[PDB]
Curated annotation (Swiss-Prot):
GO annotation, cellular component aspect: cytosol
InterPro entries, per the entry: AlgH-like
Family: Belongs to the UPF0301 (AlgH) family.
Domain of life of the organism encoding this protein: Bacteria
NCBIfam families linked to this entry: PRK00228.1-1 (NF001266)
Gene3D superfamilies per UniProt: VC0467-like, VC0467-like domains
PANTHER family in UniProt: UNCHARACTERIZED PROTEIN YQGE (PTHR30327), UPF0301 PROTEIN YQGE (PTHR30327:SF1)
Protein name: UPF0301 protein VC_0467
Length: 187
């Protein structure tokens, strides 16, 4: 009769790996982490789009006063990324759970997203999360719209792992992703 057992492709906590046959140049070789996926649509952040300014630079720009000495002087030269085209003037810290921030969303035991200024004060200080990348703007899809992009020859997906986000070099994030899908670019 009608026992509607399905699949429910919720892609939250999943990675979006661009195909070598990607048309859109804005995602030519992107790897997006879905932070939220539901009937309203989907929200994601680009993991390998390093911007010009550095994490330290953006802080200075925002004139954020650190709450402690900035010992981690080196992680402060690391760059901030291009999260996506939507709200390019908004911040999104994707990191490994450390402390409690006013406005934070926990994905797992190793991944969470903080969007409150508070977190900015610990960056560069021993109090900053052991792993984090700062993104500006995010990637958005309308209701179901993402669900349809999949049936197209644009993306492929696999559950996410923190290392791919806070460890492997940018230049290899994509290269290792598709490879993880048993594949390699054209030629």
């Amino acid at each position: 009769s009608d026992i509607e057992v399905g699949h429910s492709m919720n892609l939250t906590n999943h990675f979006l790996v661009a195909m070598p046959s990607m048309k859109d140049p804005y995602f030519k070789r992107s790897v997006i982490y879905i932070c939220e996926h539901n009937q309203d649509g989907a929200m994601g952040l680009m993991i390998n789009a390093p911007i010009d300014i550095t994490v330290g630079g953006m802080l200075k720009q925002v004139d954020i006063e650190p709450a402690y000495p900035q010992s981690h002087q080196e992680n402060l030269k690391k760059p901030v990324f291009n999260g996506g085209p939507v709200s390019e003037d908004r911040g999104f810290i994707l990191h490994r759970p450390r402390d409690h921030y006013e406005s934070s969303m926990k994905m797992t035991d190793d991944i969470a997203v903080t969007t409150s200024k508070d977190i900015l004060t610990v960056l560069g200080t021993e109090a900053e999360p052991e792993g984090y990348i700062v993104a500006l703007g995010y990637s958005g899809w309308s209701a179901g719209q993402l669900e349809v992009e999949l049936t197209e020859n644009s993306w492929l997906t696999i559950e996410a792992d923190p290392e791919l986000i806070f460890n492997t070099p940018v230049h290899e994030k994509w290269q290792k992703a598709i490879q993880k899908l048993g594949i390699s670019p054209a030629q």
